[PDB]
Symmetry: C2
């Protein structure tokens, strides 16, 4: 009953991504890890409380991940194709469950939830990072709008992808993404 | 009632159509809808008995309101270009509503998907009304071969704009995207006067 708070945040994260936030319950979450009514209520009291920590968690899964992209990638366009190809990477989960960030922010946005701002920082995250890549890659002056555009590109791809249950399209789209990203960058 | 219960149903379906979009499907309760029609717990259940029943007709009403909206984009249209334009500019016109509640079409679709709900493919027929239409406007414009491919990317472009504009609450980004789509189209459409 100490650091195992971090453990229930894990299960609620997966649950919120796979199930949606409003439709996941304590029973759901408490069953995942394995706890009773009192063993659970200890660490947690309200759903919104659990959601706070997952959004914290997610922001780590997202900047640290965005690290490994800066890592493996040894150039600008490299570190940014790491983003466009995460979609190819998680094509199965995206076509069934949608984008983790998008599906969360749009859900929180509809509900009119207090935390939409916190959730949207995962978008802000990716954004500021693609904004550095663009800077470093060739168009420092246009980086901001190219950030918002591509970010948007990917969400439209994941959106029709999930709804049409169409993994192919995700591929169609990521091709268009790459091609467009050609007529964009400079040679280095 | 007589032929009028026909329009008593509509009254619940009409009411629900608005809430579903403003609140979410899951979120919208029977009490939300009866309160909104202001009728006996009596009359309501005569017409409808589950949330699922109500959603089924709310989607048929949408599929109806939709294909009829796509009609005005053909009667007032005279050029496939003119008639694709209609599809980009709904975002500008509805920028406000889209900025707050999202694309009416994509928002329901991702909820039903995330909900693993049964009305999924049905809500998706809304997307197909957009797709197939854009397809024949692209063709009639002289992009026949590629018409099914451009319709979906154009469709995609709208959902990207709507998702980020909603998440960020930013009509400015919605505005920047639409204008960018209009340039997209023109630069993709082989011309003809």
């Amino acid at each position: 009953q100490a650091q195992t708070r971090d453990q229930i945040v894990a299960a609620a994260d997966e649950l919120f991504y796979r199930q949606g936030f409003a439709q996941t319950s304590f029973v759901d979450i408490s069953a995942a890890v394995g706890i009773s009514r009192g063993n659970f209520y200890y660490h947690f009291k309200t759903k919104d409380e659990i959601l706070a920590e997952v959004i914290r968690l997610r922001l780590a899964r997202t900047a640290q991940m965005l690290a490994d992209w800066q890592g493996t990638g040894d150039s600008p366009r490299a570190r940014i194709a790491s983003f466009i190809d995460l979609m190819i990477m998680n094509r199965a989960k995206i076509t069934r469950y949608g984008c983790p960030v998008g599906s969360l922010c749009t859900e929180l946005s509809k509900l009119d939830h207090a935390a939409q701002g916190q959730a949207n920082g995962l978008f802000t995250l990716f954004r500021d990072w693609l904004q550095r890549q663009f800077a470093e890659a060739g168009c420092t002056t246009e980086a901001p709008a190219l950030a918002m555009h591509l970010l948007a590109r990917s969400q439209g791809a994941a959106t029709l992808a999930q709804s049409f249950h169409d993994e192919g399209f995700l591929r169609s789209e990521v091709a268009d993404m790459h091609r467009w990203l050609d007529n964009t960058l400079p040679m280095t």
